[PDB]
């Protein structure tokens, strides 16, 4: 199984990708506000807000750091006067349970875009 390397950057810079940010393969990076998680594309790590079916599935399956998911329904969202990036995940599928971390020294997406602010749509 391979993660969609650098896809979080593509979601906010490529229009076709922003319009439909689905099909991405991500690793859970870190785990009320229990539905707000950290996900990893192998290069960048960003916040993901689980909603609807995803929020139910993630909680019942007790998904945690290292599990690999494929996003099926998602919306991109930028908040706090364009400072904060979030992927709203409405549906996903479990790809692999408790896999080894592909990267532990990944870059926080919001930190990248604060340094490169012109790249976003």
């Amino acid at each position: 199984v391979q993660l969609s390397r650098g896809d979080f950057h593509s979601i906010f810079t490529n229009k076709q990708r922003y319009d439909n940010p689905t099909g991405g393969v991500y690793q859970v990076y870190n785990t009320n506000r229990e539905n707000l998680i950290m996900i990893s594309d192998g290069i960048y790590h960003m916040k993901a807000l689980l909603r609807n079916q995803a929020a139910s599935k993630f909680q019942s399956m007790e998904l945690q750091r290292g599990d690999i998911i494929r996003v099926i329904i998602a919306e991109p969202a930028i908040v706090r006067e364009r400072k904060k990036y979030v992927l709203l995940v409405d549906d996903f599928e479990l790809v692999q349970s408790r896999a080894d971390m592909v990267n532990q020294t990944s870059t926080f997406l919001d930190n990248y875009f604060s340094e490169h602010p012109n790249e976003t749509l």
Binding site: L36, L49, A77, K84, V86, L88, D90
Partner: protein, 97 residues
């Protein structure tokens, strides 16, 4: 913190495939809700039976009033007919008598 992010939980989704799922409820929470629903549906049914019965009683009442009024009108016309029959009867009797 991430309150501005968490605020998006309830923002209507773009996808029609995105379905809200109520956070898990215990059997005790569910039993209360279900018992409440049972009571509400039983009240609605009891009320609808009353309505059907009333509509039925009204149909019967309105038809009876209709038949009564028509029979009054038919009686009035029959009375006028007999009057004209008698008039002609007398005119013939005068024509010979």
């Amino acid at each position: 913190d991430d309150d501005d992010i968490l605020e998006l939980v309830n923002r209507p989704p773009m996808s029609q495939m995105a379905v809200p799922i109520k956070p898990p409820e215990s059997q005790a929470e569910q039993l209360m809700k279900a018992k409440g629903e049972v009571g509400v549906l039983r009240q609605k049914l009891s009320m609808l039976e009353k309505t059907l019965r009333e509509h039925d009683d009204n149909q019967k009442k309105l038809e009876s009033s209709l038949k009564s009024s028509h029979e009054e009108e038919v009686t009035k016309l029959k009375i006028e007919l007999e009057r004209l029959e008698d008039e002609r009867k007398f005119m013939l009797l005068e024509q010979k008598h």
